[PDB]
Amino acid sequence: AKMAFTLADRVTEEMLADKAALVVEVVEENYHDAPIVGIAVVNEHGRFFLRPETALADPQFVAWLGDETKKKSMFDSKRAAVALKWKGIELCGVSFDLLLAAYLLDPAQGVDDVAAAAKMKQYEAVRPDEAVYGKGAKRAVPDEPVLAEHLVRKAAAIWALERPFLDELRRNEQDRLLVELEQPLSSILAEMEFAGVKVDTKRLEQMGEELAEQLRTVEQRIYELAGQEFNINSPKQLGVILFEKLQLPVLKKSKTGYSTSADVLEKLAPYHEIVENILHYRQLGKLQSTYIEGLLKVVRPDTKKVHTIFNQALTQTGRLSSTEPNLQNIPIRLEEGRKIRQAFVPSESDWLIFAADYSQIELRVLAHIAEDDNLMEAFRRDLDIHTKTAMDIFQVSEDEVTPNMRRQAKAVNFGIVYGISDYGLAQNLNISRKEAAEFIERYFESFPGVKRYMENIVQEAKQKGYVTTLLHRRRYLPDITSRNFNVRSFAERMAMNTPIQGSAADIIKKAMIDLNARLKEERLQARLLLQVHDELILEAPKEEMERLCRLVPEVMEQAVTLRVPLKVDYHYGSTWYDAK
Template sequence: MEKKLVLIDGNSIAYRAFFALPLLNNEKGIHTNAIYGFTMMLMKILEEEKPTHMLVAFDAGKTTFRHKTFEEYKGGRQKTPPELSEQFPLLRELLNAYRILAYELDNYEADDIIGTLCAEAEKEGFEVKVISGDRDLTQLASEHVTVDITRKGITDVESYTPETIQEKYGLTPKQIIDLKGLMGDASDNIPGVPGIGEKTALKLLKEFGTVEHLLESLERVSGKKVKENLEQHRDLALLSKQLATILRDAPLGITLEDTKYEGYDLDKVVALFKELGFNSLLGKMNVKEAEEETAHLASIRYTIAREVTESMLANESALIVEILEDNYHKAPILGFALANENGNVFIPTDVALSSSLFRQWLEDGEKKKSVFDAKRAIVALKWQGLDMKGIDFDLLIASYLLNPSHSTEDVASVAKAKQYVNVQSDESVYGKGAKQAVPDEPILAEHLVRKAAAIRELKQQFINDLQENEQYSLFTELELPLTFILAEMEYAGVKIDVERLREMGEELNEQLKTIERDIYQLAGQEFNINSPKQLGVILFDKLQLPVMKKTKTGYSTSADVLEKLAPYHEIVEKILHYRQLGKLQSTYIEGLLKVVHSDTNKVHTIFNQALTQTGRLSSTEPNLQNIPIRLEEGRKIRQAFVPSEPDWVIFAADYSQIELRVLAHIANDPNLIEAFRNDLDIHTKTAMDIFHVSEEEVTSQMRRQAKAVNFGIVYGISDYGLSQNLNISRKEAANFIERYFASFPGVKQYMDDIVQQAKQKGYVTTLLHRRRYLPDITSRNFNVRSFAERTAMNTPIQGSAADIIKKAMIDLAERLQQEKLQARILLQVHDELILEAPKAEVERLTKLVPEVMEHAIELRVPLKVDYHFGPTWYDAK
């Protein structure tokens, strides 16, 4: 069998992945874009290359033997962004799960490890594939070594062999070192010879072969200036070549045998993918169809009911209402299960729903019911014409409050936290994906009964834990009541003016056609606007716009490049607009039309109450929290959201700067508190402080930057993150953050104090005792610890803001009922509540809604609510 060694330049690929992909987060808030990109590349390599040996080489530290030769080596490089640094420990975990050797060597670079292993592998008859984002490694190419350099994205590579290097540069692989010696390398701060670029260097090397031969033959060099530069900087040329040379004999502490690859650890990879939220990658893994859990389950006694009798029902029961589909609106109910003092019973759907006795029991508020995911059960039954009452315990919500980072996919995943193993996972019973199916009745019945029994068994343990954590009132007074309100909102849905939405689609199509014609006219020809290659030719070859960034396939036409080019030609703004409208059309207009319920002409979004670690609600199917509103055409999509009754209006009320107000309260900062109590514009106030100017001198640019700093502080932003947001240098961004803390010392004190508290307790809490555990807060790894510290600062602010709006929803629903108003809450979007109401009630709502929302929780600063209303959601803004 052919021996094949794959060597990966770990730091280089991680960097490439980080900057190629947007900043992704998993549900714990950890950045994952570099790991995701790295994993995609890894999966592609394993599939295509089928290596027998494998290694990922990392740089060991900032200094290497090259720094002794040239102190400024790599001196121009910026500090690694913390958003990337925090991903390296998880990258090591990934490689461990894949059973791939990760190796670093003090005083040497990853390149030297790779170069040395290449030399050894060639002697042993291996075929070698090197993967990096750094073209320096092309010098290693040989008859048996191919070097793949990433270009567009992370999985698209360009392969270098001696033949391709000859074809591209007219050089041998070894001459790549001479090329660097002459032209230098800005990324590694290799100086090269001043005045000699790639073109001149290639010409000289084709004539003289090496740097040494060139320097010995200066009398034959044509061009006075080039010759002078080479004479004056002879030492620099030789030094640069030395710095660019990859070692082939580094003193490695490993052998080729250590790099042997025998496949990954499936369980570890699957567990890590789940932790990181890589659901799309999970689908590509060879996961077993069903786990052999049944062998570990203790026997359980139950009956299958063919009719419902009084003896099956009790004053207190655990209840399962089983729906398999993720979108449970109008989804079929597979069956019911009860566990109570009278025993365990499975009731088939037709038996249950045709029984008046069972229906009365469901709707009896005196009959207490413990469930898993109350909202799901309530909504499913509402579609069956049943209004379930009496729910006093929800295992999903209880588990989520006790630790929001634990998996709450099904009863089994929650039960595992308490070492309760007498229940199977849903996936093991139903399968997953295309192979998902409902089993025969005996298997289904036992599974549902086991789930009901688990809820009954675990209920008191969870209640005890909530009480011990001072979270029982958070459970009973906030989250459980909210479940019922969210169920009402989901079932009610939001009316969509389908015709208006279609009209908007047609209007967008017309706009796209007009912009397309304008672009063709400005370009002087027709071309495929959606093709980066064709667009690059038009912009940079034909219109001669300055080239901002190049890729191996041509010119970059990414959004950030186009934004920089906008001042140079009016075609650029048109192209940006064209792209934005295209996304609106496909993602939002067509996307919304797909999910409008055919019977109701409404969208029935699903609010996820037990997902985020901060306590924020999210929504899916459709995601109504993500409709773009920065672009006017995006805002117009809200015109399609209308009241469900004639002569009604949409009424929207949102908290103004709630997170900054929460920060002022928690940090107890006098300057911040004073600003809010005096109703000052907080961004103007911050601009005055960090720029040391009077109110009159604050420009719109200063206010914009101050706003980014204000909200950035809330999110624990780093200087790198702020620099990206404002398109400024990291030094300037760090300066802004420093000046902010000088202006608001209470905020700085709070951040220092909360980190210390988190280290002592292992968690942080919100104003209403919602917890977030931070096991990494005492990690020895600086990057892992730093991320946990930023999370400690941010969670009490975000989480308390989430608590406040949830409390406001409960209080508002209660007041609307008390005052016998017909108005009802439709949506919660970030810090905004959207209602629909009869026009006759609007005047009452303009007083009642702000009053309720502003007094949901009393803070040191006033809460402020803005409201608007109109015939559509668009008009209510």
């Protein structure tokens, strides 16, 4: 049952064909500066396993890796590329990435190893990585014969599966999406991760000192007001103090017991002085543990940088996610929190952070796809979209829009951009399900084109089995036909939301590719550091700011041509915080 291969102790020319499946195995979850445990090559001449100390010290092998005209098929090529970048080796000529191919074919499969991709085409001659490496504490690299066979089987699966994946992509009109968008983006992301983002650890540490002291003050005040010490961070213990000792009313239960969420506690504040102090404690503790301690833990002491990993094959919308650290949820809303962004600084002296963000990209996409005359007109006039929505829903003039009217309109706009239920909108606005339904109804009378689009997109999802984005990304929605109402409704909302959010993701990904090309053409030293859904963050010499002010917004604005303009705001400063 053992697949034939050559366990090479030296590199030979027949290993360096100009078309090959390549496995460069990094087993550590976080691949930054991580070991490469083994290498496998499959090509028309046979199957080969190479030890990394052998292969990666071979000038011919390394040149082969770096020759763009020697084509390679891989799985998760960014992992390999980055691990190699840390060893000073460049990987080029990756013409097919099976991870990204499987992701585009069906993002809900959750394909995370070669075995899971292979299964989609009834190929099972490869083991899941979890079966070979083990799980958790038991995770280990096996002995060489077991390792070697695994890597060769992965490589053989890649070799076999390229053709059928490419054929289905083509049938779906997704072949360009793979080859011209996701794969090129993967190289750009690899560069971004490798560059990293410099952190002023001293400033974070001082902030942590300050928080630590404010926490101790509040924590003591909590115990005074409770008349005893307890674990504030245990919703169980807190529940007993609040709802039993202090007899506060129970406005919401959870599966386990009593809810202690911020929104419940906010309704309880008038009853007892402990509640505000709990909320304050939760806010500070969140900052301290998730953003000060959580960032400090993942700063590389060697670089003084954080090197995130972007997961390009996770979301069902096509958005990127970010880990270790997650840089897509750094506080912005509250000033105390926002100050965390002061710790993200340029990696060189006399460089600055430059940030550019799309203004209402999701609603502008909606205008374009729905062709709603009112929404299209609003963006053609570059109106404040929330004020304009308030004017229409409440049928008032601009100077009759009150702050609460605007807040409520904005909540409706948010519910559209994120596909939330009427229940969700109700929770968000602290109103009844019924009143939420009336708001939504008023919206559709002002934007009948959006209503029509919603109805049409759901019918299309029902007919075809899936919805698509501008750039041909697909999401299958088998629950759209369910008889469970909550199940069906969620799927209908995903039918509505996905073309919106997915198309925005498509646009920014194209912008990133276009921007990388232009930065090179223009000979700038500016580099992309991060993407945060609708914004791009770069660092550059201070001497490049004026050029980037013109360059970056134009590249982002012209990424696609919609029925409405795209608009990009930008800022720069000495820290990410100041780039506001």
